[PDB]
Nucleic acid binder design. Structure first.
Lengths: 333, 49
RNA sequence: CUAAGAAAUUCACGGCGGGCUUGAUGUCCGCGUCUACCUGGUUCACUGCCGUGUAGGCAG
Protein backbone atom coordinates (compact mmCIF):
# COMPACT_ATOMS: atom_id res chain seq x y z
CA UNK A 1 0.00 0.00 0.00
CA UNK A 2 1.36 3.35 -1.16
CA UNK A 3 0.24 6.76 0.06
CA UNK A 4 -1.86 9.47 -1.57
CA UNK A 5 -0.14 11.69 -4.13
CA UNK A 6 -2.58 14.62 -4.40
CA UNK A 7 -2.82 16.00 -0.85
CA UNK A 8 -3.76 19.47 0.39
CA UNK A 9 -3.38 20.33 4.06
CA UNK A 10 -5.38 23.49 4.68
CA UNK A 11 -4.87 26.81 6.43
CA UNK A 12 -5.32 27.00 10.19
CA UNK A 13 -4.67 29.85 12.64
CA UNK A 14 -5.70 32.43 10.04
CA UNK A 15 -4.89 36.07 10.92
CA UNK A 16 -6.54 39.14 9.43
CA UNK A 17 -4.90 42.08 7.67
CA UNK A 18 -3.42 44.16 10.48
CA UNK A 19 -4.58 47.77 10.33
CA UNK A 20 -2.46 50.58 11.74
CA UNK A 21 -3.55 53.77 13.47
CA UNK A 22 -1.75 56.32 15.60
CA UNK A 23 -2.24 58.11 18.88
CA UNK A 24 -0.66 58.93 22.21
CA UNK A 25 0.67 56.56 24.86
CA UNK A 26 -1.21 56.09 28.19
CA UNK A 27 -4.47 57.13 26.50
CA UNK A 28 -4.47 53.78 24.66
CA UNK A 29 -7.01 52.26 27.07
CA UNK A 30 -10.11 54.04 25.71
CA UNK A 31 -8.86 53.95 22.11
CA UNK A 32 -11.12 52.46 19.48
CA UNK A 33 -11.22 55.55 17.26
CA UNK A 34 -7.65 56.45 16.27
CA UNK A 35 -7.12 57.83 12.73
CA UNK A 36 -5.46 55.50 10.26
CA UNK A 37 -1.87 55.86 9.15
CA UNK A 38 -1.93 56.55 5.41
CA UNK A 39 0.69 56.15 2.70
CA UNK A 40 2.06 59.54 1.65
CA UNK A 41 4.29 60.45 -1.33
CA UNK A 42 7.76 61.96 -1.65
CA UNK A 43 10.70 62.20 -4.05
CA UNK A 44 14.30 61.05 -3.71
CA UNK A 45 17.53 62.34 -5.23
CA UNK A 46 20.31 59.90 -4.40
CA UNK A 47 23.74 58.91 -5.61
CA UNK A 48 24.74 55.48 -6.92
CA UNK A 49 26.43 53.54 -4.13
CA UNK A 50 26.05 49.95 -5.36
CA UNK A 51 29.04 47.85 -6.37
CA UNK A 52 30.46 48.60 -9.81
CA UNK A 53 32.67 46.54 -12.10
CA UNK A 54 36.20 47.12 -13.34
CA UNK A 55 35.88 44.85 -16.40
CA UNK A 56 34.05 45.72 -19.66
CA UNK A 57 33.17 49.19 -18.28
CA UNK A 58 34.77 52.40 -19.46
CA UNK A 59 36.45 54.76 -16.98
CA UNK A 60 34.55 57.67 -18.51
CA UNK A 61 31.31 55.68 -18.27
CA UNK A 62 31.68 55.04 -14.53
CA UNK A 63 32.87 58.61 -13.93
CA UNK A 64 29.73 59.82 -15.70
CA UNK A 65 27.57 57.29 -13.83
CA UNK A 66 28.71 57.96 -10.24
CA UNK A 67 28.75 61.76 -10.61
CA UNK A 68 25.17 61.88 -11.89
CA UNK A 69 22.26 61.62 -9.45
CA UNK A 70 19.33 59.21 -9.36
CA UNK A 71 15.82 60.70 -9.16
CA UNK A 72 13.37 58.01 -8.13
CA UNK A 73 10.00 58.22 -6.40
CA UNK A 74 9.05 56.17 -3.33
CA UNK A 75 6.15 55.71 -0.93
CA UNK A 76 6.42 56.25 2.82
CA UNK A 77 4.18 56.23 5.88
CA UNK A 78 4.80 58.14 9.12
CA UNK A 79 3.01 58.78 12.36
CA UNK A 80 1.53 62.25 12.90
CA UNK A 81 3.74 64.74 14.67
CA UNK A 82 1.66 64.78 17.88
CA UNK A 83 1.15 60.99 18.05
CA UNK A 84 3.91 58.67 19.25
CA UNK A 85 2.19 55.26 19.43
CA UNK A 86 1.62 52.81 16.57
CA UNK A 87 -1.53 50.79 17.24
CA UNK A 88 -1.80 47.45 15.41
CA UNK A 89 -5.10 45.56 15.55
CA UNK A 90 -5.97 42.25 13.89
CA UNK A 91 -8.19 39.22 14.45
CA UNK A 92 -7.24 35.54 14.54
CA UNK A 93 -9.65 32.71 13.74
CA UNK A 94 -8.67 29.49 15.52
CA UNK A 95 -10.61 26.81 13.67
CA UNK A 96 -9.81 23.35 15.06
CA UNK A 97 -8.79 19.97 13.72
CA UNK A 98 -5.97 20.64 11.27
CA UNK A 99 -5.09 16.94 10.95
CA UNK A 100 -7.13 15.62 8.05
CA UNK A 101 -7.02 17.27 4.62
CA UNK A 102 -9.92 17.57 2.18
CA UNK A 103 -8.12 16.43 -0.99
CA UNK A 104 -7.21 12.73 -0.99
CA UNK A 105 -6.75 9.95 -3.51
CA UNK A 106 -6.34 6.96 -1.19
CA UNK A 107 -9.12 6.31 1.30
CA UNK A 108 -6.79 3.98 3.23
CA UNK A 109 -4.15 6.69 3.61
CA UNK A 110 -6.83 9.21 4.65
CA UNK A 111 -8.29 7.20 7.51
CA UNK A 112 -4.77 5.99 8.38
CA UNK A 113 -3.83 9.65 8.88
CA UNK A 114 -7.08 9.95 10.86
CA UNK A 115 -5.84 7.06 13.03
CA UNK A 116 -2.53 8.75 13.79
CA UNK A 117 -4.05 12.20 14.38
CA UNK A 118 -6.64 10.65 16.72
CA UNK A 119 -3.68 8.98 18.44
CA UNK A 120 -2.04 12.37 18.96
CA UNK A 121 -5.32 13.89 20.16
CA UNK A 122 -5.68 10.90 22.51
CA UNK A 123 -2.29 10.82 24.22
CA UNK A 124 -1.66 14.58 24.63
CA UNK A 125 -3.62 17.49 23.20
CA UNK A 126 -1.76 20.40 21.61
CA UNK A 127 0.54 21.69 24.35
CA UNK A 128 4.03 22.75 23.23
CA UNK A 129 2.90 23.98 19.81
CA UNK A 130 0.19 25.94 21.63
CA UNK A 131 2.92 27.22 23.97
CA UNK A 132 4.96 28.46 21.01
CA UNK A 133 2.00 30.07 19.20
CA UNK A 134 0.83 31.77 22.41
CA UNK A 135 4.37 32.97 23.06
CA UNK A 136 4.74 34.38 19.55
CA UNK A 137 1.48 36.19 20.28
CA UNK A 138 2.93 37.25 23.64
CA UNK A 139 5.89 39.13 22.18
CA UNK A 140 5.61 41.28 19.07
CA UNK A 141 6.84 39.09 16.21
CA UNK A 142 4.06 40.52 14.05
CA UNK A 143 5.72 43.91 14.55
CA UNK A 144 8.60 43.22 12.18
CA UNK A 145 10.70 46.38 11.97
CA UNK A 146 8.23 48.26 14.17
CA UNK A 147 9.57 46.21 17.10
CA UNK A 148 13.25 47.19 17.18
CA UNK A 149 13.89 50.70 18.44
CA UNK A 150 10.66 50.86 20.43
CA UNK A 151 10.92 51.56 24.14
CA UNK A 152 7.60 49.99 25.21
CA UNK A 153 5.55 47.33 23.41
CA UNK A 154 2.25 46.02 24.81
CA UNK A 155 0.10 43.15 23.54
CA UNK A 156 -3.57 42.93 24.53
CA UNK A 157 -5.51 39.82 23.49
CA UNK A 158 -9.29 39.53 23.80
CA UNK A 159 -11.50 36.51 23.12
CA UNK A 160 -14.85 36.51 21.32
CA UNK A 161 -18.03 34.60 22.16
CA UNK A 162 -20.78 37.15 21.36
CA UNK A 163 -21.02 40.94 21.53
CA UNK A 164 -19.06 40.76 24.80
CA UNK A 165 -15.68 39.64 26.07
CA UNK A 166 -14.51 36.36 27.61
CA UNK A 167 -10.98 37.11 28.84
CA UNK A 168 -8.62 40.10 28.77
CA UNK A 169 -4.92 39.29 28.99
CA UNK A 170 -2.08 41.83 28.99
CA UNK A 171 1.41 40.98 27.73
CA UNK A 172 4.55 43.09 28.07
CA UNK A 173 6.51 42.26 24.93
CA UNK A 174 9.67 43.85 26.37
CA UNK A 175 9.48 41.90 29.63
CA UNK A 176 8.57 38.72 27.76
CA UNK A 177 11.77 37.73 26.00
CA UNK A 178 12.46 37.20 22.32
CA UNK A 179 14.51 34.00 22.12
CA UNK A 180 14.29 31.67 25.14
CA UNK A 181 10.77 30.31 25.56
CA UNK A 182 9.28 30.24 29.08
CA UNK A 183 5.82 29.71 30.58
CA UNK A 184 3.66 31.87 32.83
CA UNK A 185 0.11 31.68 34.18
CA UNK A 186 -1.45 34.06 31.65
CA UNK A 187 0.58 32.35 28.93
CA UNK A 188 -0.62 29.00 30.30
CA UNK A 189 -4.21 30.28 30.13
CA UNK A 190 -3.93 31.53 26.54
CA UNK A 191 -2.12 28.36 25.45
CA UNK A 192 -4.86 26.30 27.12
CA UNK A 193 -7.65 28.27 25.41
CA UNK A 194 -6.15 27.88 21.96
CA UNK A 195 -5.11 24.33 22.91
CA UNK A 196 -8.82 23.59 23.08
CA UNK A 197 -9.18 25.69 19.92
CA UNK A 198 -6.73 23.57 17.89
CA UNK A 199 -8.06 20.01 18.47
CA UNK A 200 -11.52 20.64 17.01
CA UNK A 201 -13.21 21.19 20.38
CA UNK A 202 -15.28 24.08 19.02
CA UNK A 203 -14.69 27.67 17.89
CA UNK A 204 -12.07 30.13 19.14
CA UNK A 205 -11.90 33.67 17.74
CA UNK A 206 -9.37 36.17 19.07
CA UNK A 207 -8.50 39.78 18.35
CA UNK A 208 -5.10 41.19 19.28
CA UNK A 209 -4.35 44.85 19.99
CA UNK A 210 -0.75 46.08 20.09
CA UNK A 211 0.85 49.39 21.06
CA UNK A 212 4.40 50.69 20.61
CA UNK A 213 6.07 53.94 21.61
CA UNK A 214 8.31 54.93 18.72
CA UNK A 215 8.15 58.74 18.76
CA UNK A 216 6.12 61.38 16.98
CA UNK A 217 6.72 61.56 13.25
CA UNK A 218 8.77 58.38 12.96
CA UNK A 219 8.69 55.86 10.15
CA UNK A 220 6.29 52.93 10.30
CA UNK A 221 6.71 49.94 8.01
CA UNK A 222 3.65 48.53 6.27
CA UNK A 223 4.37 45.69 3.88
CA UNK A 224 5.40 46.24 0.28
CA UNK A 225 3.25 45.55 -2.76
CA UNK A 226 5.20 43.51 -5.30
CA UNK A 227 5.78 44.08 -9.00
CA UNK A 228 7.61 41.92 -11.54
CA UNK A 229 9.63 44.42 -13.65
CA UNK A 230 11.28 41.89 -15.96
CA UNK A 231 13.01 43.92 -18.65
CA UNK A 232 10.54 46.37 -20.17
CA UNK A 233 8.12 48.71 -18.32
CA UNK A 234 10.90 50.01 -16.07
CA UNK A 235 9.02 52.80 -14.38
CA UNK A 236 9.39 56.16 -12.68
CA UNK A 237 8.03 54.60 -9.47
CA UNK A 238 9.63 52.32 -6.88
CA UNK A 239 8.64 51.03 -3.42
CA UNK A 240 4.91 50.50 -3.78
CA UNK A 241 3.51 50.12 -0.27
CA UNK A 242 0.45 48.02 0.59
CA UNK A 243 -2.90 49.56 1.45
CA UNK A 244 -6.58 48.79 1.96
CA UNK A 245 -9.51 51.20 1.94
CA UNK A 246 -7.62 54.36 3.08
CA UNK A 247 -5.21 52.74 5.56
CA UNK A 248 -1.71 51.26 5.80
CA UNK A 249 -1.87 47.51 6.33
CA UNK A 250 0.33 44.45 6.75
CA UNK A 251 -0.28 41.34 4.64
CA UNK A 252 -1.90 38.25 6.12
CA UNK A 253 0.96 36.12 4.78
CA UNK A 254 3.65 37.92 6.75
CA UNK A 255 1.78 38.20 10.06
CA UNK A 256 1.07 34.48 9.68
CA UNK A 257 4.77 33.89 9.00
CA UNK A 258 5.42 35.88 12.18
CA UNK A 259 3.10 33.47 13.99
CA UNK A 260 4.84 30.37 12.54
CA UNK A 261 8.38 30.64 13.99
CA UNK A 262 8.53 27.42 15.99
CA UNK A 263 11.35 25.08 14.90
CA UNK A 264 14.30 25.21 17.30
CA UNK A 265 15.69 21.80 16.23
CA UNK A 266 16.59 22.34 12.59
CA UNK A 267 19.71 20.28 11.77
CA UNK A 268 21.94 23.16 10.62
CA UNK A 269 22.04 25.16 13.87
CA UNK A 270 20.28 25.27 17.24
CA UNK A 271 21.56 28.41 19.00
CA UNK A 272 20.92 31.11 16.40
CA UNK A 273 17.20 31.11 17.19
CA UNK A 274 14.17 29.51 15.55
CA UNK A 275 13.38 29.55 11.83
CA UNK A 276 10.16 29.40 9.82
CA UNK A 277 8.27 26.10 9.79
CA UNK A 278 7.75 24.81 6.24
CA UNK A 279 8.71 21.80 4.09
CA UNK A 280 12.32 22.27 2.94
CA UNK A 281 12.54 24.63 5.90
CA UNK A 282 14.77 27.61 5.20
CA UNK A 283 14.18 31.33 5.68
CA UNK A 284 13.95 33.43 2.52
CA UNK A 285 16.12 36.37 3.63
CA UNK A 286 19.19 34.29 4.49
CA UNK A 287 19.13 32.17 1.34
CA UNK A 288 21.11 29.34 2.97
CA UNK A 289 19.36 26.03 2.29
CA UNK A 290 18.52 24.95 5.81
CA UNK A 291 16.93 21.49 6.25
CA UNK A 292 18.57 19.82 3.28
CA UNK A 293 16.40 17.01 1.83
CA UNK A 294 19.32 14.56 1.69
CA UNK A 295 18.88 13.91 5.41
CA UNK A 296 15.83 12.19 6.88
CA UNK A 297 14.63 15.43 8.51
CA UNK A 298 12.22 16.92 5.96
CA UNK A 299 8.48 16.92 6.10
CA UNK A 300 8.35 14.93 2.83
CA UNK A 301 10.70 12.04 3.56
CA UNK A 302 9.94 12.12 7.28
CA UNK A 303 6.20 11.74 6.69
CA UNK A 304 6.91 8.99 4.14
CA UNK A 305 8.99 7.25 6.82
CA UNK A 306 6.46 7.87 9.59
CA UNK A 307 3.28 6.71 7.83
CA UNK A 308 4.62 3.62 5.98
CA UNK A 309 7.58 2.27 7.99
CA UNK A 310 5.76 3.05 11.30
CA UNK A 311 8.94 4.19 13.06
CA UNK A 312 9.63 7.44 14.84
CA UNK A 313 12.41 9.86 15.75
CA UNK A 314 12.35 11.84 19.02
CA UNK A 315 9.17 13.70 19.96
CA UNK A 316 10.38 17.16 18.83
CA UNK A 317 10.49 16.02 15.19
CA UNK A 318 6.86 14.94 15.56
CA UNK A 319 6.10 18.40 16.98
CA UNK A 320 7.65 19.78 13.79
CA UNK A 321 5.49 17.47 11.65
CA UNK A 322 2.32 18.42 13.53
CA UNK A 323 3.30 22.08 13.07
CA UNK A 324 3.69 21.35 9.35
CA UNK A 325 0.16 19.97 9.16
CA UNK A 326 -1.26 22.85 11.24
CA UNK A 327 0.59 25.14 8.80
CA UNK A 328 -0.95 23.53 5.74
CA UNK A 329 0.49 23.22 2.29
CA UNK A 330 1.16 20.54 -0.33
CA UNK A 331 2.53 17.06 0.36
CA UNK A 332 4.06 15.46 -2.71
CA UNK A 333 5.03 17.01 -6.03
CA UNK B 1 6.53 71.68 -6.50
CA UNK B 2 7.62 72.04 -2.88
CA UNK B 3 7.25 69.17 -0.43
CA UNK B 4 4.62 69.59 2.26
CA UNK B 5 2.37 67.70 4.66
CA UNK B 6 -1.09 68.71 5.90
CA UNK B 7 -1.03 72.54 6.15
CA UNK B 8 2.73 72.69 6.72
CA UNK B 9 5.86 73.09 4.62
CA UNK B 10 8.38 70.35 5.34
CA UNK B 11 11.96 69.29 4.77
CA UNK B 12 12.43 65.61 3.92
CA UNK B 13 13.84 63.20 6.46
CA UNK B 14 16.68 62.13 4.18
CA UNK B 15 17.83 65.73 3.74
CA UNK B 16 18.33 66.06 7.50
CA UNK B 17 19.92 62.61 7.54
CA UNK B 18 22.33 63.74 4.85
CA UNK B 19 23.15 66.87 6.81
CA UNK B 20 23.91 64.78 9.90
CA UNK B 21 26.44 62.46 8.23
CA UNK B 22 28.63 65.19 6.72
CA UNK B 23 31.72 63.85 8.46
CA UNK B 24 34.36 62.67 5.94
CA UNK B 25 37.61 64.67 5.90
CA UNK B 26 39.98 62.06 4.45
CA UNK B 27 38.92 61.77 0.86
CA UNK B 28 42.29 61.96 -0.91
CA UNK B 29 41.76 65.26 -2.76
CA UNK B 30 42.39 67.99 -0.19
CA UNK B 31 41.58 69.61 3.14
CA UNK B 32 40.84 72.92 1.43
CA UNK B 33 37.17 72.15 0.87
CA UNK B 34 36.13 70.55 4.15
CA UNK B 35 33.83 67.78 5.36
CA UNK B 36 31.71 65.92 2.82
CA UNK B 37 28.91 63.43 3.39
CA UNK B 38 29.71 59.82 4.19
CA UNK B 39 29.01 57.75 1.07
CA UNK B 40 30.30 54.69 -0.81
CA UNK B 41 32.14 56.15 -3.81
CA UNK B 42 31.86 59.33 -1.79
CA UNK B 43 30.31 61.76 -4.21
CA UNK B 44 29.20 65.38 -3.85
CA UNK B 45 26.81 65.22 -6.79
CA UNK B 46 25.77 68.87 -6.45
CA UNK B 47 29.24 69.84 -7.68
CA UNK B 48 29.40 66.94 -10.13
CA UNK B 49 32.60 65.42 -8.72
C1' C C 1 -17.94 19.28 -3.38
C1' U C 2 -16.15 26.45 -3.25
C1' A C 3 -10.84 27.03 -11.15
C1' A C 4 -9.41 22.02 -5.52
C1' G C 5 -4.49 22.74 -3.23
C1' A C 6 0.10 26.88 -1.46
C1' A C 7 3.74 30.93 -0.84
C1' A C 8 8.52 36.74 4.42
C1' U C 9 9.40 38.17 -0.99
C1' U C 10 13.75 43.39 0.15
C1' C C 11 17.75 47.07 2.55
C1' A C 12 19.82 53.06 1.04
C1' C C 13 18.90 58.18 -0.72
C1' G C 14 20.23 66.37 -1.26
C1' G C 15 15.93 68.20 -6.55
C1' C C 16 18.15 73.01 -7.69
C1' G C 17 19.70 77.28 -9.49
C1' G C 18 17.01 82.07 -12.10
C1' G C 19 13.15 85.24 -13.80
C1' C C 20 8.58 92.37 -15.12
C1' U C 21 2.42 88.95 -17.66
C1' U C 22 0.90 93.95 -19.65
C1' G C 23 -2.07 97.38 -22.14
C1' A C 24 -8.03 99.22 -22.95
C1' U C 25 -13.51 98.92 -21.63
C1' G C 26 -21.44 101.80 -20.62
C1' U C 27 -24.68 95.60 -18.37
C1' C C 28 -29.19 97.41 -19.93
C1' C C 29 -34.69 98.21 -20.50
C1' G C 30 -39.91 96.39 -17.52
C1' C C 31 -42.87 93.98 -13.62
C1' G C 32 -49.28 93.07 -8.16
C1' U C 33 -46.87 87.35 -4.59
C1' C C 34 -51.98 86.51 -2.48
C1' U C 35 -55.79 83.88 0.34
C1' A C 36 -56.80 81.15 5.90
C1' C C 37 -55.11 79.83 10.92
C1' C C 38 -56.55 77.68 19.04
C1' U C 39 -49.48 76.33 19.99
C1' G C 40 -53.81 74.07 26.63
C1' G C 41 -46.71 72.22 23.02
C1' U C 42 -46.51 68.59 29.80
C1' U C 43 -40.94 73.39 27.39
C1' C C 44 -37.83 66.45 32.85
C1' A C 45 -45.22 61.13 33.33
C1' C C 46 -41.51 67.51 38.57
C1' U C 47 -39.11 71.39 41.94
C1' G C 48 -40.11 71.69 48.28
C1' C C 49 -39.33 72.89 56.50
C1' C C 50 -40.48 67.63 60.03
C1' G C 51 -35.98 61.40 60.57
C1' U C 52 -31.26 63.44 55.03
C1' G C 53 -36.10 54.96 56.03
C1' U C 54 -42.05 56.07 50.57
C1' A C 55 -42.73 59.30 57.99
C1' G C 56 -46.86 66.91 56.90
C1' G C 57 -51.95 71.33 56.57
C1' C C 58 -50.38 76.09 51.15
C1' A C 59 -53.09 81.54 45.96
C1' G C 60 -48.23 73.74 43.88
Amino acid sequence: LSTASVLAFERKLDPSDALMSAGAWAQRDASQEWPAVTVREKSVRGTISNRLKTKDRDPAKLDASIQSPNLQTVDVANLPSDADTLKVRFTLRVLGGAGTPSACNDAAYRDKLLQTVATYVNDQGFAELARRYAHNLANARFLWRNRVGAEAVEVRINHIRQGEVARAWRFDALAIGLRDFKADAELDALAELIASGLSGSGHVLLEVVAFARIGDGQEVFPSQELILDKGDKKGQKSKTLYSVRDAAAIHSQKIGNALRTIDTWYPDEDGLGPIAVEPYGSVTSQGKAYRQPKQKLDFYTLLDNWVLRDEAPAVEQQHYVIANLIRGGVFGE
